[PDB]
Ligand binder design. Structure first.
Ligand code: HEM
Length: 407
């Protein structure tokens, strides 16, 4: 009987937005990047307004502010998709805890991610990388890099760290994908319960016959001392399993696409492997694949450079936009593997800064060196315009990456 007849411009754009190019900001995010001030209003999928943080130093300050809680079960935590309500209703790992509780659980896992342990993992990582490469190269002239290399490699590595038997990998890889990428709460809740039932059986097995890896250590020590609830152990292992899978696999696939679209830099990298760690840092900054890991809720009023975040408002620290802050990175939208990408926010900042960041850095270095060593002729088997990018409501990446090479 009547429709919207007036101009449709808004000062609270829909958020998140979808990438159209794997290594560029969505058009809407480039606009948010360009507007002065640390904060901007956005509209989430259900109509609720929230703040996004769009500048680098303010992103650090707010991630460091204990008044921005990580409690996903809070009624006002910003949900960016209906699938989030599964997370709001479900038990929480320490990614959803605040101090002091956050520290007591995170410290149960840190021993597996120390610089010294990551170093001792290089033989396993190199062996896993080159083994899946052996298989993919022998299996055809073309391949899907995602299912045949990008995903299995970090899956096997994190399963060894955790004590999760890789014999069950078809089951929990599928459940991990369904949980991270589901668009509705039912699909997400079902995938979470699938993983939870699997991990619960693993825990009882380790109570009968003590097991290897971090789940084995948690069952034998903290669980037996009542220091972690059985439900929390499940959530903790599940967080580590999924983060260990999906993040590195996405960085691998998107780095390959990005590097093949910048052949001069890829060639420089091939010619001087000492550049590989710096290139990994730049690709992390540039691809910034985890904006869904920026959500917070204010438990008190917070003044930010003349703007006010009110208690109970949702805040999303958008690290991809913050990593394109031209006051920190000159010419921020240019890929430069020679630049200083230090201080980037791809792993967050503060007490929740990525537990796995140095494992991810080790994996990505080994992977890039291996692809340059073993498949220097690697190229995409389809044009970039035929690839399909995941939406902005999940970890960025591609679900399929057809590639080919020289026989
Ligand atoms: C591959 C690139 C990766 C990226 C870009 C990434 C990104 C992030 C970000 C931005 C956060 C901060 C979340 C927040 O502030 O709420 C985070 C936390 C976390 N990440 Fe990573 N991650 C990566 C790899 C990994 C890996 C391999 C693991 C292995 C277990 C992992 C485990 C975790 C955990 C457990 C947390 C929660 C830390 C805490 O709450 O104290 N991540 N990650």
């Amino acid at each position: 009987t009547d429709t919207a007849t007036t101009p449709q411009t808004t000062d609270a754009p829909a958020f998140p937005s979808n990438r159209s190019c794997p290594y560029q900001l969505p058009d809407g995010y480039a606009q948010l990047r360009d507007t002065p001030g640390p904060l901007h209003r956005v509209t989430l999928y259900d109509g609720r307004q929230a703040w996004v943080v769009t500048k680098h130093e303010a992103a650090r300050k707010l991630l460091g502010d204990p008044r921005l809680s990580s409690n996903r079960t809070d009624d006002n935590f910003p949900a960016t998709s209906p699938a989030f309500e599964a997370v709001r209703e479900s038990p929480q790992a320490f990614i959803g805890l605040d101090p002091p509780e956050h520290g007591t659980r995170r410290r149960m896992t840190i021993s597996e991610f120390t610089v010294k342990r990551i170093k001792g993992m290089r033989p396993e990582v190199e062996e896993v990388v080159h083994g899946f490469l052996d298989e993919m190269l022998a299996a055809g002239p073309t391949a899907d890099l995602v299912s045949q290399f990008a995903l299995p490699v970090p899956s096997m590595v994190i399963c060894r760290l955790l004590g999760v038997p890789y014999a069950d990998h078809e089951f929990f890889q599928d459940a991990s994908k369904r949980l991270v990428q589901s668009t509705d709460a039912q699909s997400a809740l079902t995938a979470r319960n699938d993983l939870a039932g699997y991990l619960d059986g693993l825990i009882t097995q380790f109570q009968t016959e003590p097991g290897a890896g971090l789940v084995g250590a948690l069952v034998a020590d903290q669980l037996a001392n009542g220091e972690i609830d059985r439900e929390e152990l499940i959530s903790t292992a599940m967080l580590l399993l999924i983060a260990g899978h999906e993040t590195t696999a996405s960085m691998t696939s998107l780095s390959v696409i990005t590097l093949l679209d910048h052949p001069e830099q890829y060639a420089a990298l091939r010619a001087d492997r000492s550049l590989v760690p710096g290139a990994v840092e730049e690709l992390l900054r540039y691809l910034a694949i985890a904006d869904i890991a920026g959500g917070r809720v204010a438990t008190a009023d917070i003044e930010v450079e003349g703007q006010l975040i009110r208690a109970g408002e949702g805040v999303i620290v958008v690290n991809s936009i913050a990593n394109r802050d031209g006051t920190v990175y000159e010419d921020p939208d240019a890929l430069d593997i020679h630049r200083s990408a230090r201080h980037h926010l791809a792993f967050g900042f503060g007490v929740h800064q990525c537990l796995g960041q140095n494992l991810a850095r080790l994996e990505l270095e080994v992977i890039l060196n291996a692809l340059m060593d073993r498949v220097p002729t690697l190229r995409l088997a389809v044009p970039v315009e035929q690839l399909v990018l995941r939406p902005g409501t999940t970890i960025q990446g591609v679900n399929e990456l057809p590639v080919t090479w020289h026989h």
